[PDB]
A paper describes a structure:
KPN03535 (gi|152972051) is a putative lipoprotein of unknown function that is secreted by Klebsiella pneumoniae MGH 78578. The crystal structure reveals that despite a lack of any detectable sequence similarity to known structures, it is a novel variant of the OB-fold and structurally similar to the bacterial Cpx-pathway protein NlpE, single-stranded DNA-binding (SSB) proteins and toxins.
The ten monomers are almost identical in structure and completeness and superimpose extremely well, with pairwise r.m.s.d. values ranging from only 0.2 to 0.4 Å. The capping helix α in KPN03535 is shorter than in the toxins and NlpE, although it is similar to that observed in BOF protein. In the crystal structure, the protein assembles as two stacked pentameric rings, formed by loose interdigitation of the ‘finger-like’ β1–L12–β2 structure, with outer and inner diameters of ∼80 Å and ∼40 Å, respectively, and a thickness of ∼40 Å. The buried surface area of each monomer within each pentamer (∼540 Å2) and each monomer in the interface between the two pentamers (∼600 Å2) is low. Crystal-packing and assembly analysis using PISA supported by analytical size-exclusion chromatography and static light scattering suggest that a monomer is the likely oligomeric state. Analysis of the electrostatic surface potential indicates that KPN03535 most closely resembles PriB and aspartyl-tRNA synthetase, with a prominent positively charged area similar to the DNA-binding region of these two proteins.
Residue numbers in the entry: 36 to 154
Amino acid sequence: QPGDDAVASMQTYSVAQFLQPFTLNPAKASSDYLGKWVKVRGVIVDIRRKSGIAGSYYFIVTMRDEQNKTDKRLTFNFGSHNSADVEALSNGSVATIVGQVHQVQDSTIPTLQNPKVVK
């Protein structure tokens, strides 16, 4: 996972910007981004705790473009160990979250993994 100074050093994408390549070809985009970390800024529109498999639970955080420059939403999957970050977000509030691209299947939009709320 990237630490604070590595995070401050990354470019901030809008949701529209990060999703643009996936809109063109998600197979290609998923392959180009595989394993990479992105820092995406947007408005949180849903936060939800979910029942996991094998005793676990996790959270899905959904984000829309800050200026509605796309209607597509980006989701992030936070494990139970990062409930502090999830509990500090707010629906309707702008946030910036760093997350990792894992393989995108059965979908055209990635669900960012191992996320970290920046601000």
